[PDB]
């Protein structure tokens, strides 16, 4: 069923990746934490609908930890899109539906803007576009702390702040949380400062390929208000889905329903 | 300071009203509960900025409870707008800034659509427009229950669902909560089933007068998402202010700052 | 089934009281708030088991608030016991089971100590014996504040501090909370400073009559730890029943089961 | 500094142990999870008071998991006491103060009952003595589930149920939580069926050595009510300390103050 492997890109990234199913390609880009096990529960549900689903740990994170520092420092949506294109090319994928949340969502936008020939349709979720607007207060200062306390402020927050199902978030498992531990400071040093102003949100870029922009049902309106305003002004289908920042974690069944339903409209 | 009185208008409504300050007129329309004491803390702060602030209990609610049944049964935004115009005329207010949340917001829009000559600028907050767009549990069924259980289901829900400031929600005082208890079943019989369909949200009505549409910063996105989409597509300035459904209760200082700042742009 | 009245005893207290049922007498003494509507749901369930249940508002509180200041200032367990004896005499009760929580529980203990001829068996719940028993807020300080802020510190804390069944706490209804609001400053001025030192907890006094001492199952252990230690060292049957400080509000059915079961062992 | 090593005892247990400081011996036995990193913050604070502190992971758990199945199946307080005696002998500790919570507390009691010559004074906390003196699901059924879901109900419950300082509980770190993951199913299969009944709580056993029995300040009264009743009836010093089930995690400083003060009274 699920297959796992490791492979290297000309960039020097040693990716860990997972695939399951057959049919049209769906690519699940993780959020900033870069832990693809968050997709573990949804993927089977997606693949069962007649799709081959692919995911991977992000460069420098979890089992993709063997990567050059430039791939997880000063990170931009454009660089992440290039990395996704690389791993995706190496996996002999031609053209695909892309899901992404947070920085991954930014990546999705960068994929729509700059590689439209490779996208059937895009699904971004809660894209950060402002300095500080991802959880609550400025993450952009967390880099000043020592690693242990960075991981401790981060793993102490994710449950109530956005991943608001303690049994599911914790159902990710202990090996995954141990990897996320080491992911937190790398994310804080490379993902908060640089990602927000790089999400391509211009009308023409958002319109190049079919785009379904979503927001967490229980997320406070102010966090990703700008997403809604931008999408609706650009004419992008914008909607809410159950959960907050990790709909695939807190509500895997509704996440797969949304993924499949949207993908089916653009086959 | 605060002046209070009771007066009858031609509809047969014996209004209770409050006024404070001097200067341009600001009218604070209550939410569906119709209890104007929720504005008690904000009003002084607004009036201190050089404004005459007027509020009142809604027909059939609290100290305006002595009113004909049609004024609080099968309630529509149009009926509420006519009642507000009546009380505004008798207080001989010519033209005013109007604030309204929920049904009051629906009233404000109805005031923009059908009485634009009387409105200087409008402020609606969290306008109900759908049978499902509400952070409760299908209000439109509550009318089937007994009065006591309607009021107790009511008073248990808005404190965390609609205010999220328990000490502030509760500082309203017990005479006010005593009125609100008796308001709850009347609200359930007359405000959930008829009011959502009646808010005029067409572009043409929304553009007649200056309009600042707001949503609670801490409201989860799905509750009034439609408000955001509609306002942004129509070109209406839309933003978030601290609080949820009762910003004047949970966050009075920022509520008055918002009211004053917006009103000052349109004198 | 319920009968209500008012009557005056020799102290000058104008009591409000309620009675229901027939059979052996059970008297439910309120907690410090002195609001007998907290027993509204339990009483019927007790009365249906073949008992006439009597309750009343405490002197100076709710509908018994027309009372001399001496009856609700510098309050002691002994004074409360004498008042309860007076009201019971006027109601032509000779002999009865007594329930009491907090100061009422203190009253029960004093009734066991000084009026053993009048009680068949006693039930006290979470009797305060120390200064500022509650962990977080020092009740012994509330008297320094003004009435509004006292009532707001009170009505705002009891719900999660004392009941943790919010839907039950307010189904008490509007009038009950309206009375309790005004009860708070009187309780704060008269009940935290003097009641804890007056509970008769000597071995011989606790043994004069059958005594079942209870603590809320969900109460933090330290709040009424002393109750457990004292009762168990004296050989008094001590157990917990569902709820915290207001078991008759949060858990009426198990409260009535406990009252009936214990009373049934001593007719 | 803290010293770390591994060693083998006659039972076939590959123990991981930690030691710090000099002076009289204080031994900190883990709760059922058997993870001694929970003592990481307290130990230094104890050592600074002039004590050599020793702790270890319990057989079959965390870094002591390489152990024969009999040491973590059908676990009794007596077996755990014998294992603890083995590890203390191997570290050539003669006589010491022992702290223990939950099963570790049961062990402490078993050490007082059956090895009193080795105990300076004993400190047990929240000893399980019944199959049902908690709130929710019967722990004795958890073994019927698959390991992943066993770990998932455990890690999802204790943070708010037993160890309630989420920032501290999570401050344990991810390597520790990764070990605790694999600890959960072994605990469920070997610790809840058999342990509650093996704690020696008879008066004669409890009096053999100085014993201070404690309960969590914020623990609900019903969880370890039996502990309070038993200790008070036997004449054992019984008191509350800040926290719930993991005081050394949630409130390390006061845990260390308690350990040191009690130990110093019996040096």
Short mmCIF file of C-alpha atoms in Angstrom, two decimals, chain C:
data_model
loop_
_atom_site.label_atom_id
_atom_site.label_comp_id
_atom_site.label_asym_id
_atom_site.label_seq_id
_atom_site.Cartn_x
_atom_site.Cartn_y
_atom_site.Cartn_z
CA UNK C 1 -47.08 20.37 45.70
CA UNK C 2 -44.80 23.24 46.76
CA UNK C 3 -46.21 25.73 49.17
CA UNK C 4 -44.56 29.12 49.74
CA UNK C 5 -45.01 31.70 52.54
CA UNK C 6 -43.51 34.40 54.69
CA UNK C 7 -43.54 34.66 58.47
CA UNK C 8 -41.71 36.57 61.18
CA UNK C 9 -39.94 35.02 64.15
CA UNK C 10 -39.06 36.67 67.46
CA UNK C 11 -35.65 37.80 66.15
CA UNK C 12 -37.37 40.17 63.75
CA UNK C 13 -36.45 38.10 60.69
CA UNK C 14 -39.08 38.07 57.94
CA UNK C 15 -38.47 34.58 56.54
CA UNK C 16 -39.34 33.32 53.10
CA UNK C 17 -39.83 29.54 53.13
CA UNK C 18 -40.93 26.65 50.92
CA UNK C 19 -42.39 23.25 51.79
CA UNK C 20 -43.23 20.17 49.74
CA UNK C 21 -44.41 16.63 50.39
CA UNK C 22 -45.46 14.64 53.42
CA UNK C 23 -43.75 12.32 55.87
CA UNK C 24 -40.69 12.76 58.06
CA UNK C 25 -39.16 16.23 58.01
CA UNK C 26 -36.06 17.07 55.97
CA UNK C 27 -34.70 20.63 56.25
CA UNK C 28 -32.34 21.96 53.56
CA UNK C 29 -30.27 24.89 54.86
CA UNK C 30 -28.71 26.94 52.04
CA UNK C 31 -25.06 27.87 51.65
CA UNK C 32 -23.74 31.34 52.43
CA UNK C 33 -25.62 32.88 49.49
CA UNK C 34 -28.85 32.04 51.34
CA UNK C 35 -30.78 31.41 48.11
CA UNK C 36 -33.12 28.44 48.55
CA UNK C 37 -33.96 28.27 44.84
CA UNK C 38 -30.74 26.25 44.54
CA UNK C 39 -32.84 23.42 46.02
CA UNK C 40 -35.64 23.86 43.46
CA UNK C 41 -34.80 20.76 41.48
CA UNK C 42 -33.74 18.43 44.33
CA UNK C 43 -36.71 19.02 46.62
CA UNK C 44 -39.34 17.36 44.43
CA UNK C 45 -37.08 14.33 43.98
CA UNK C 46 -36.68 14.12 47.75
CA UNK C 47 -40.38 14.75 48.39
CA UNK C 48 -41.33 11.93 46.02
CA UNK C 49 -39.48 9.50 48.30
CA UNK C 50 -42.01 10.09 51.10
CA UNK C 51 -40.67 13.15 52.92
CA UNK C 52 -41.87 16.69 53.57
CA UNK C 53 -38.94 18.94 52.64
CA UNK C 54 -38.56 22.45 54.04
CA UNK C 55 -36.20 25.19 52.89
CA UNK C 56 -35.94 28.95 53.28
CA UNK C 57 -33.87 31.96 52.33
CA UNK C 58 -31.31 32.81 55.00
CA UNK C 59 -31.65 35.97 57.14
CA UNK C 60 -30.69 39.04 55.16
CA UNK C 61 -30.61 37.15 51.85
CA UNK C 62 -32.96 36.95 48.84
CA UNK C 63 -36.65 37.03 49.92
CA UNK C 64 -35.68 36.84 53.62
CA UNK C 65 -33.50 39.94 53.31
CA UNK C 66 -35.78 42.09 55.48
CA UNK C 67 -33.97 41.18 58.71
CA UNK C 68 -32.10 43.00 61.50
CA UNK C 69 -28.41 43.68 60.75
CA UNK C 70 -27.35 41.51 63.71
CA UNK C 71 -28.68 38.45 61.86
CA UNK C 72 -26.40 38.90 58.82
CA UNK C 73 -23.36 40.72 60.23
CA UNK C 74 -20.63 39.01 62.28
CA UNK C 75 -22.41 35.76 61.46
CA UNK C 76 -21.52 32.64 63.43
CA UNK C 77 -22.60 29.01 63.18
CA UNK C 78 -24.30 29.39 66.57
CA UNK C 79 -26.39 32.38 65.45
CA UNK C 80 -27.42 30.56 62.27
CA UNK C 81 -28.39 27.49 64.29
CA UNK C 82 -30.58 29.59 66.59
CA UNK C 83 -32.25 31.24 63.58
CA UNK C 84 -32.92 27.87 61.93
CA UNK C 85 -34.41 26.60 65.20
CA UNK C 86 -36.69 29.66 65.33
CA UNK C 87 -37.99 29.24 61.78
CA UNK C 88 -38.43 25.49 62.33
CA UNK C 89 -40.41 26.12 65.51
CA UNK C 90 -42.75 28.49 63.70
CA UNK C 91 -43.30 25.84 60.99
CA UNK C 92 -44.25 23.29 63.69
CA UNK C 93 -41.37 20.96 62.93
CA UNK C 94 -40.38 19.00 66.04
CA UNK C 95 -37.64 16.75 64.69
CA UNK C 96 -35.86 16.66 61.37
CA UNK C 97 -32.95 15.67 59.19
CA UNK C 98 -30.76 18.70 58.44
CA UNK C 99 -28.68 19.27 55.32
CA UNK C 100 -26.22 22.13 55.06
CA UNK C 101 -23.34 23.23 52.84
CA UNK C 102 -20.61 25.76 53.71
CA UNK C 103 -22.01 28.07 56.42
CA UNK C 104 -25.17 25.98 56.35
CA UNK C 105 -22.98 22.96 57.00
CA UNK C 106 -21.40 24.88 59.86
CA UNK C 107 -24.96 25.51 61.02
CA UNK C 108 -25.66 21.78 60.85
CA UNK C 109 -22.63 21.09 63.03
CA UNK C 110 -23.76 23.70 65.54
CA UNK C 111 -27.22 22.17 65.43
CA UNK C 112 -25.70 18.78 66.22
CA UNK C 113 -23.66 20.32 69.03
CA UNK C 114 -26.27 22.49 70.73
CA UNK C 115 -29.72 21.22 69.62
CA UNK C 116 -29.27 17.42 69.50
CA UNK C 117 -32.88 16.95 70.60
CA UNK C 118 -34.08 18.52 67.32
CA UNK C 119 -32.15 16.52 64.67
CA UNK C 120 -32.76 12.95 63.63
CA UNK C 121 -29.54 13.03 61.58
CA UNK C 122 -27.25 15.67 60.10
CA UNK C 123 -25.64 16.16 56.69
CA UNK C 124 -22.89 18.80 56.33
CA UNK C 125 -20.99 19.47 53.11
CA UNK C 126 -17.67 21.32 52.78
CA UNK C 127 -17.71 23.24 56.05
CA UNK C 128 -15.28 26.20 56.14
CA UNK C 129 -12.92 25.97 59.12
CA UNK C 130 -9.96 28.15 58.03
CA UNK C 131 -9.41 31.76 56.85
CA UNK C 132 -9.64 32.19 53.04
CA UNK C 133 -10.35 28.46 52.40
CA UNK C 134 -10.65 29.01 48.59
CA UNK C 135 -7.12 28.75 47.00
CA UNK C 136 -7.15 31.68 44.51
CA UNK C 137 -9.19 34.54 46.00
CA UNK C 138 -9.06 35.65 49.67
CA UNK C 139 -12.74 35.83 50.69
CA UNK C 140 -11.58 37.51 53.91
CA UNK C 141 -10.61 40.53 51.77
CA UNK C 142 -13.74 40.94 49.64
CA UNK C 143 -15.26 43.23 52.29
CA UNK C 144 -12.88 46.06 51.40
CA UNK C 145 -14.28 46.41 47.88
CA UNK C 146 -17.39 48.26 46.79
CA UNK C 147 -20.62 46.32 46.34
CA UNK C 148 -20.68 46.17 42.53
CA UNK C 149 -17.12 44.87 42.27
CA UNK C 150 -17.73 42.40 45.12
CA UNK C 151 -20.77 40.97 43.35
CA UNK C 152 -18.77 40.82 40.17
CA UNK C 153 -15.83 39.04 41.73
CA UNK C 154 -18.43 36.63 43.17
CA UNK C 155 -20.91 35.95 40.32
CA UNK C 156 -17.93 35.76 38.07
CA UNK C 157 -15.96 33.12 40.08
CA UNK C 158 -18.77 30.39 41.84
CA UNK C 159 -19.60 29.01 38.36
CA UNK C 160 -16.14 27.48 37.70
CA UNK C 161 -14.97 27.99 41.26
CA UNK C 162 -17.91 26.36 43.05
CA UNK C 163 -20.27 24.45 40.70
CA UNK C 164 -18.59 23.57 37.40
CA UNK C 165 -21.99 22.89 35.83
CA UNK C 166 -22.59 26.24 34.20
CA UNK C 167 -25.83 25.21 32.54
CA UNK C 168 -27.08 24.02 35.93
CA UNK C 169 -25.72 27.06 37.77
CA UNK C 170 -27.77 29.49 35.72
CA UNK C 171 -30.80 27.39 35.19
CA UNK C 172 -31.48 28.69 38.69
CA UNK C 173 -33.29 31.36 36.69
CA UNK C 174 -33.32 35.12 36.46
CA UNK C 175 -34.91 36.04 39.77
CA UNK C 176 -32.58 33.79 41.74
CA UNK C 177 -29.49 35.36 40.20
CA UNK C 178 -31.04 38.81 40.68
CA UNK C 179 -31.30 38.13 44.40
CA UNK C 180 -27.86 36.48 44.59
CA UNK C 181 -26.21 39.56 43.05
CA UNK C 182 -27.45 41.72 45.93
CA UNK C 183 -26.69 38.88 48.37
CA UNK C 184 -22.93 38.99 47.59
CA UNK C 185 -21.80 42.15 49.43
CA UNK C 186 -23.86 41.16 52.44
CA UNK C 187 -22.27 37.69 52.39
CA UNK C 188 -18.76 39.20 51.97
CA UNK C 189 -19.30 41.69 54.78
CA UNK C 190 -20.96 39.14 57.05
CA UNK C 191 -20.05 35.54 56.18
CA UNK C 192 -15.79 35.02 55.38
CA UNK C 193 -14.45 36.84 58.55
CA UNK C 194 -16.48 35.09 61.30
CA UNK C 195 -17.93 31.74 60.11
CA UNK C 196 -14.75 29.58 59.82
CA UNK C 197 -13.74 29.92 63.48
CA UNK C 198 -17.22 29.02 64.79
CA UNK C 199 -17.75 25.51 63.36
CA UNK C 200 -17.87 23.10 66.35
CA UNK C 201 -15.51 20.31 65.30
CA UNK C 202 -14.74 18.72 68.67
CA UNK C 203 -15.07 14.95 68.81
CA UNK C 204 -17.85 14.90 71.41
CA UNK C 205 -19.92 17.49 69.53
CA UNK C 206 -19.62 15.66 66.19
CA UNK C 207 -20.72 12.41 67.89
CA UNK C 208 -23.88 13.73 69.60
CA UNK C 209 -26.10 12.78 66.65
CA UNK C 210 -25.79 10.67 63.48
CA UNK C 211 -23.60 12.60 61.05
CA UNK C 212 -22.69 12.00 57.41
CA UNK C 213 -19.99 14.45 56.30
CA UNK C 214 -19.53 14.92 52.55
CA UNK C 215 -17.18 16.73 50.18
CA UNK C 216 -17.59 17.50 46.50
CA UNK C 217 -16.18 14.74 44.32
CA UNK C 218 -14.77 17.31 41.89
CA UNK C 219 -13.55 19.78 44.51
CA UNK C 220 -9.75 20.23 44.61
CA UNK C 221 -8.47 18.03 47.42
CA UNK C 222 -6.87 20.83 49.43
CA UNK C 223 -9.98 23.06 49.65
CA UNK C 224 -11.77 20.89 52.24
CA UNK C 225 -8.94 18.50 53.12
CA UNK C 226 -9.38 19.44 56.79
CA UNK C 227 -12.97 18.18 56.65
CA UNK C 228 -11.78 14.72 55.61
CA UNK C 229 -9.01 14.56 58.22
CA UNK C 230 -11.28 15.74 61.05
CA UNK C 231 -14.24 13.51 60.19
CA UNK C 232 -12.14 10.38 59.65
CA UNK C 233 -10.13 10.92 62.83
CA UNK C 234 -13.36 11.30 64.83
CA UNK C 235 -14.85 8.17 63.24
CA UNK C 236 -17.51 10.11 61.32
CA UNK C 237 -18.67 8.55 58.03
CA UNK C 238 -17.05 10.70 55.39
CA UNK C 239 -17.53 10.29 51.67
CA UNK C 240 -17.83 12.45 48.55
CA UNK C 241 -20.86 13.00 46.39
CA UNK C 242 -20.89 14.26 42.79
CA UNK C 243 -20.33 17.96 42.24
CA UNK C 244 -18.18 20.53 44.08
CA UNK C 245 -19.64 23.16 46.44
CA UNK C 246 -23.26 23.18 45.15
CA UNK C 247 -24.05 19.48 44.63
CA UNK C 248 -27.79 20.18 44.75
CA UNK C 249 -27.38 22.53 41.76
CA UNK C 250 -24.81 20.70 39.63
CA UNK C 251 -26.02 17.15 40.42
CA UNK C 252 -29.58 17.22 41.77
CA UNK C 253 -30.39 13.52 41.27
CA UNK C 254 -27.38 12.10 43.10
CA UNK C 255 -27.85 14.77 45.78
CA UNK C 256 -31.41 13.59 46.40
CA UNK C 257 -30.28 9.97 46.32
CA UNK C 258 -27.70 10.74 49.01
CA UNK C 259 -30.15 12.72 51.17
CA UNK C 260 -32.80 10.00 50.92
CA UNK C 261 -30.38 7.08 51.43
CA UNK C 262 -28.77 8.62 54.51
CA UNK C 263 -32.06 9.83 56.03
CA UNK C 264 -33.53 6.36 55.53
CA UNK C 265 -30.98 4.80 57.91
CA UNK C 266 -32.18 6.91 60.86
CA UNK C 267 -35.97 7.20 60.97
#
